[PDB]
Amino acid sequence: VTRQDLIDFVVNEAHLLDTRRYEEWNALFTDDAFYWVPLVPDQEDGLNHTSHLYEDKLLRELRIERLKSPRAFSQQPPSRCHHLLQVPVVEQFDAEGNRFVLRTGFHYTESQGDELQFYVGTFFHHLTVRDGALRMTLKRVNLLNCDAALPAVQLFI
Amino acid sequence: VTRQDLIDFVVNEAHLLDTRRYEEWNALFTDDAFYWVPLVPDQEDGLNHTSHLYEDKLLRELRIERLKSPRAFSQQPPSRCHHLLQVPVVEQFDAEGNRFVLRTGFHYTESQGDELQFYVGTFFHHLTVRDGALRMTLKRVNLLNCDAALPAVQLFI
Amino acid sequence: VTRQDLIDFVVNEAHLLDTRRYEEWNALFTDDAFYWVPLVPDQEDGLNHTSHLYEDKLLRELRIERLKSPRAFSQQPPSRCHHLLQVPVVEQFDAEGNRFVLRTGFHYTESQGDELQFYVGTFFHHLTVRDGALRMTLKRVNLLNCDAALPAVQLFI
Amino acid sequence: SYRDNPDAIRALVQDDRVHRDLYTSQELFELEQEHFFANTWNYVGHESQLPKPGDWISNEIAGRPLIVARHSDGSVRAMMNRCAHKGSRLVNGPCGNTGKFFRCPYHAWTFKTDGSLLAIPLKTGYENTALHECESAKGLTTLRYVRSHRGFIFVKISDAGPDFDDYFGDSLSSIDNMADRSPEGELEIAGGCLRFMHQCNWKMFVENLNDTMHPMVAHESSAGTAKRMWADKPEDEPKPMAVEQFAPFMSDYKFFEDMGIRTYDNGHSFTGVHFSIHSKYKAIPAYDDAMKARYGEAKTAQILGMARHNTVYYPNLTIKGAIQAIRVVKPISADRTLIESWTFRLKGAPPELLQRTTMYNRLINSPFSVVGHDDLQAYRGMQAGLHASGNEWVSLHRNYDPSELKGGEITTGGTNELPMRNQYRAWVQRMTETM
Amino acid sequence: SYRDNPDAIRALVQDDRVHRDLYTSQELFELEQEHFFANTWNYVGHESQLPKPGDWISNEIAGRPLIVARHSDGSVRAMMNRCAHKGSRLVNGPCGNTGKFFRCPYHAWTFKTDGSLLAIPLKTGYENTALHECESAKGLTTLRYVRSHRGFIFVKISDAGPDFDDYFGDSLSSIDNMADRSPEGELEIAGGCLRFMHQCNWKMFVENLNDTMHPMVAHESSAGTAKRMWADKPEDEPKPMAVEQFAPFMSDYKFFEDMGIRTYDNGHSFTGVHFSIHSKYKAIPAYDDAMKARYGEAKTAQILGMARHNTVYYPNLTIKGAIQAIRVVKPISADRTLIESWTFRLKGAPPELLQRTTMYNRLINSPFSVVGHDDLQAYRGMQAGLHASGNEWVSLHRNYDPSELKGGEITTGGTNELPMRNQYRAWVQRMTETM
Amino acid sequence: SYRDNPDAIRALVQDDRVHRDLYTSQELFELEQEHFFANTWNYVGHESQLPKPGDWISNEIAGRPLIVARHSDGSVRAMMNRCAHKGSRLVNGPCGNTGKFFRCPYHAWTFKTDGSLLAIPLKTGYENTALHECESAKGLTTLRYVRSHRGFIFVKISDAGPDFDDYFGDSLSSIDNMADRSPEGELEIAGGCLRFMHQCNWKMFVENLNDTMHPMVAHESSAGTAKRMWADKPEDEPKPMAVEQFAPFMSDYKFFEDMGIRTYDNGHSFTGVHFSIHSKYKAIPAYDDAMKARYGEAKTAQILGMARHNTVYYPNLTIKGAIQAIRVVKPISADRTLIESWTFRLKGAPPELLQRTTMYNRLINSPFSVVGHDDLQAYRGMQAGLHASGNEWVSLHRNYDPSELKGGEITTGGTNELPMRNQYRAWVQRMTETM
Ligand SMILES: O=C(O)Cc1c[nH]c2ccccc12
Ligand SMILES: O=C(O)Cc1c[nH]c2ccccc12
Ligand SMILES: O=C(O)Cc1c[nH]c2ccccc12
Ligand code: FES
Ligand code: FES
Ligand code: FES
Ligand SMILES: [Fe+3]
Ligand SMILES: [Fe+3]
Ligand SMILES: [Fe+3]
């Protein structure tokens, strides 16, 4: 409804990801929404081209549920993540058309044991209003070094 | 009095730390305030559990005064620090109760000679009003990798 | 005219630098403006002291034009850059005097191939109004480790 | 202390077990880079990556930078990425096109696309010298072991070892199937490349490919989770392709035992001789119609009934038949390896084939993949644990029988540990042949 | 060039001086990891960290990963964190509980808590093989040198060297005092662990423990600052515990000289035989009342009158008596070391004891501590400066006398440099015993 | 395998070509640090950096830390930055002022500014010991090869090799010109220092200095771009100093050939005997007036007409005459080097000279400079490409003639590759002298 509401939505989503509240984070998506991590710059779509992550509801639920398992050997000890965000910028704002697009620079840090890695890039958020609640229809994560060699990334960015 | 005043307070405190104006920075605390760096996540208190830093007025004064000594061998050449902050978020705002709580993501960089290190985490600020001036009653610094192996950290975070 | 315009100007300049729109970025400068990167902390001026970069219009045009050459051997493959900015702070605001000073903390990342480097520091922006458009008269880039040993930096910070 | 010490090289491998130094010793890694990887055929690329004349790609094999280029006559040539003057690289980047000649970016020496010298600027300075007697007069150093099969390019740095035909034997049929699933009989590179850095020796990754005992244990938290998540739904509802590709990992031991394994000489082996984990994968009618129109009923049935699980071309290539995806091993150090996963488009096929291939590639081979996380955790655990003392060996006794020492094409059950033993026999031979 | 060169190992140590290679040479560090740390008793943990059956902790000693676990019979066992199949770790993390058996996360081999083999999945594949003859049939490799004193667990990897009793002699009394300051006579681990990474060899940190000439010079900018800050205050006002713990560092030479030192065999030595820097530390009446009720008058006075400054158990443990804090040395490389500081809770004591212990630990051992900053700066300066040429020795001549070569328990003044000489004599012996 | 192998050291250099191991081998780098840089004179600083008594600077030469200080009598002394007690550094930082004595920050040993011992605290602990017989009694280890020419300070760690006068010969004239361009005949350090890390061996940087073949090829994208950007403007408009300094890089071949080159013994050589790229550089009337007032017409004309391009003092110093800028080479590893660029102020000259010098330094030597980017890319390409097999040599055949083997002062054309050959002959000699 207001721009500040969209900024708060993005900030609160990052905060929810930071405090391991995955069940609440996944509820912000629409049923047919996608969580997309492109593999190449200016990628056209996630259907005919490979990506790092192109998750629908089922795959997101699978990833969230695997973290609670006592046999997730790669998650012993569990990893921790931190998001540092630039202030979101509202690119398009269609109040009548029910389409909002936001661009946000991010620095993401992931640490496990005595190991730490960081990444930088941009979030593109597509938001709509369902029954008076703001909800995502697509979350695209553009990495600066998407096509470079990467180590294992075990948490949601 | 206003939220923007608290945001400006946090930003200006970081700026004061960055410019090496320690005498002005230490004056923002209350006489019984604490500068706390927990050692483990979700630490209960700094009394019955070890911490990286739990400083009252005397210890802060000692640390500030040691920096002016000509025999602080570990500070030759002097170190430099930089703070990069996400916009502060006001969680609790008790105008009548005189108690404010702020949460701020941070990226902190410290460099000496040809060596440089960085850390990420969250600041929790407890603020009150004394004689019309905003003053701190507790500064808690949550590090992402608090329980990991760390090198020497020689300045205020 | 308004502060938020100045914050938007700084943010948009960083965005223009991020998306390789050098021709539009160079048009924001005044004809006699300077792009200054000091070499020592609290450097007095860029005339009688060495600096990393002290570019007028001609040198900026030369650097921008060299990137389009098919024989820029050091730019194969091309490098990519990302800016993460703290919210700008307006120090001096002379509406009648036509001179504005802004201070912004920054984290800058540059990646080429499988190599990546990052720097932190402060931007000082001097802005004025020419024919109703905000334009820069000096862009000073204070690096935290300006006097330390550095590798090659091939893009605009 | 293995240098110039071949018997101590042989002593690290026994009939049914190996030593830990094969996974940790850095001096052994350097000796490999000097000896083993220079004496075997290694995948460097595909012909569809350099279609036009003058097109080139750059690769790195056994510590050597290589240019693989398309000469003006349409052939494929391989040369050292090293100028004849003072050693500077001629081409910077992964791929490109130089037109008619290479030009050094240091002093602008020029060479032909096949590597021969073309011109030296200011030649008047070399009249009374001895440049024309040295090897800098011949131009770039070339490789005369370059071969292509259905577009796949293999090179061999040195002249020691069996030739391409005897090196690969009859395993090439796998590649043929990968190429016979296209109505035009051609493959092209499309969909991008996934690059994954493992903090483990390359050997462990090469072993994980034909290990049927691991998936039900290590991959339980993900494959079992998916199986339980679907188990509930009506048996009539269509299975999402994610669940379709994830479910076979949690099969019982009899399934993998009956899948089968075949091994060739020189460490090449494939899994799934008769029926595999890619056997159901739904069905596409348009693709079947196209293949029927091109080949006929019998040939189409024969081709689509060949569903090998995965094939290993030692020491760096692995491929899948019905998925059209390959993986390449890029050793970096004793405890650092790089894995590259490519995908192919079949010429003339409907887009659903490529969509399925990209889905599988993202799900399995991405650095963000949970299956990759579990396998990498297993590799890291092995690398960390192999430093303990006491028991200093790695067991390869499963389904072992000395009659396998005769070699040749051997077919056996799915849980046999024969491929590892054959791999290490070949590795010992390839090191010791040139010491 | 020290490998298989024991005489050149002995040549780096003289009667009253040492060579610089003991602090810089990486090959010497590797030889130590193979020889020295495998021939001495090392602190791996406390019994209160694994109270219940099946409870385990994981440690890293001399380049070996170890599991220290509580067997079902209540004893403590030590084994290699390395599966018998192919080497993968069994447990990931610092501590945990496995119930009744260990299960490998690669192929689900299973072993008992004492390390013996329990079950191999799909055993039918090993009938006609030779698995049962090798050492993989026994299970995990175990350590039969595990001992406990008042809860402290010590291990020794190899079988060369004196046994626990003769190795430690009468220094164990220090530990006893640390345990006798509790009404229940028991310690537990509480308060967390501080981990500090030093860019210096572990040897310098081990020497700084019994060096009484350093504190008034290196620690001047902080301890002297505190002393001057508390100056001009009324003599009746209570001292903050920070000032109480900081003031003794800036004492005169006579204080430290009279404070005293005792040394044992095998590099074990404690400082402060008569009094110490922990002597005043105010007084708590409730704790004294409890100790009076449990022990009496004479025993309580004797226990609380024992105020050793700090004790060194070579090569990796140091403890404090009246503060209840220990430090462990974890060598990483020639120029990288990790120091871990733990704290104990005395059972049945008021919380003030633990509060004081945690305050001292934060003030002295934290990476944010100024005293640690100064000591680390001294270590880094020594590490950087020991690369200069010319004078290639380090002097240990202070208070040296040849009559100390008879060994045994020796008591002397506080500024003596005897402990370092004894440490290096023991280090030479432990190196050369297994050459 | 070069240690104690002088013949294999000689075998890597031939008359007109060199081996690749001179640029990659790490063991060769360590042997150099032990032998080569200890047997040649190296630039450690200028006298204007330490004008007052007690002023010191700290440097790092051949893996040794050094203190260069001004004694109380006004002379310049050099000592090891290593305390005589246990090796800790005495001074931390790049420069400073110690007053009358050095005081160790570990145990407060004290030494005189010339390095001799002054006082040991609590000396009463050394009466019956052997401290006074060892080398710790003399104090810091000193260097007796310290020499100064027009303020430049050169040191030589060891006693093997020719002395300063015979080592440098007549190349010192270059320095004299750099100092004769000041009305007072004095230089001072001003403007700051630029530090640039190159991921290449130092040898490549040292070779790029006298290579006239490269600038019109590698530096084309920048110098040619500037030339084309200016080409258009009226010939009467003043050229910006950026274009003035950039244009000469894109000259034809005859210009560089006629520019000229002179070489001395021991690898010292300068470029531009007749004219140079700094020849035009506009003109300043006030500076000429002052020089005329100080020297006269003839002497000023002779001094200002001497415009050498750049001079190389082997193995780590290069200078420019008419620009008043120097560069120092700081090797770090086989593939890591640090380059420092300083500027000088001429005493009594107008500020325009220093403004021009700082502009040139920023334009050419900064890590943000495009010319530096191109040169570093060439170095990195050479370092990466010298690992290819086959041709394992680097050609130095350009303008080669055996009559150059007589040595001495040799003058020749600008494109001759003689300086590199002389450099490598001197390098071979300096290695093999101490084998
Ligand atoms: O090809 C794959 O999807 C992964 C994989 C490698 N080795 C395997 C053995 C059994 C089952 C799956 C795999
Ligand atoms: O135990 C301490 O608090 C630190 C310390 C280590 N060595 C010392 C020698 C003398 C005085 C204090 C210490
Ligand atoms: O002196 C300079 O500005 C750079 C430089 C190094 N070597 C050269 C050879 C020819 C021309 C310029 C240079
Ligand atoms: S290195 Fe290629 S032309 Fe000189
Ligand atoms: S490595 Fe443990 S079961 Fe195979
Ligand atoms: S190391 Fe210098 S006084 Fe001891
Ligand atoms: Fe696997
Ligand atoms: Fe100390
Ligand atoms: Fe150059």
Numbering used by the authors:
A (entry chain A), B (entry chain H), C (entry chain E): 6 to 162
D (entry chain B), E (entry chain G), F (entry chain D): 3 to 282, 283B, 284 to 437
Q: What does the publication say?
A:
IadD interacts with IadE to form a functional Rieske non-heme dioxygenase, which works in concert with a FMN-type reductase encoded by gene iadC to transform IAA into the biologically inactive 2-oxindole-3-acetic acid (oxIAA), representing a new bacterial pathway for IAA inactivation/degradation. The Rieske non-heme iron dioxygenases, typically composed of α and β subunits that are equivalent to IadD and IadE, respectively, share a conserved α3β3 configuration. IadD features a Rieske domain (residues 44–160) and a catalytic domain (residues 1–43 and 161–437). IadE is a single-domain protein, containing a twisted seven-stranded β-sheet and 3 α-helices, which may mainly serve as a scaffold protein contributing to proper assembly of the oligomeric enzyme complex.
To understand the binding of IAA with IadD, we then determined a 2.6 Å cryo-EM structure of IadD/E complexed with IAA. An overall mushroom-shaped heterohexamer composed of 3 IadE at the “stem” and 3 IadD in the “cap” was resolved. The active site of IadD is located at the interface of IadD subunits, composed of a Rieske [2Fe-2S] cluster from the Rieske domain and a mononuclear iron in the catalytic domain of a neighboring subunit. The [2Fe-2S] is stabilized by contacts with Cys85, His87, Cys106, and His109 and the mononuclear iron coordinates with His216, His221, and Asp377. Adjacent to the mononuclear iron is the IAA-binding pocket lined by polar and hydrophobic residues including Asn210, Leu211, His216, His221, Phe251, His311, Lys322, Arg329, and Tyr362. No profound overall conformational changes were observed for IadD/E after binding of IAA. The side chain of His311 in IadD is relocated to accommodate the binding of IAA. The mononuclear iron and the coordinating residues also move slightly inwards (about 1.6 Å) following the binding of IAA. The resolved IAA-binding pocket of IadD/E is largely superimposed with that of biphenyl in the biphenyl dioxygenase structure, but contains different residues to accommodate the substrate specificity. As anticipated, mutation of residues in the pocket abrogated IAA binding.
